[PDB]
Ligand binder design. Sequence first.
Ligand SMILES: Cc1ccc(N)c(=O)n1C
Length: 119
Amino acid sequence: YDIQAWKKQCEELLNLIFQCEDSEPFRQPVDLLEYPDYRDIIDTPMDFATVRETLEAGNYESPMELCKDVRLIFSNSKAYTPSKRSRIYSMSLRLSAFFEEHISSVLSDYKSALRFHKR
Ligand SMILES: Cc1ccc(N)c(=O)n1C
């Protein structure tokens, strides 16, 4: 029932994601010199360094907000990919599966703690 525990749990999950080779294309904003048409397709860029910085600045109120930004990294990859078989997109799918597997208990524990707080 710790309402604040999600923050360190998210920091540790982000550390695991940064150790994972599949996260390398997503660690920093997409380079517009490498992908000149990126902003013609993607309206809201997102990357793991921005998520980590937002968390560390105390600019997420809940793990749901962090989860919305991480999911945006994956939906941007899906929207920008020229093929469902592309290398970078395929890395995004594995990383998404790993993230969802680990964020599930973070979200459940937070929501349960908040329900207990408001009982
Ligand atoms: C093609 C591509 C390039 C760079 C990215 N970060 C990405 O998500 N895709 C899908």
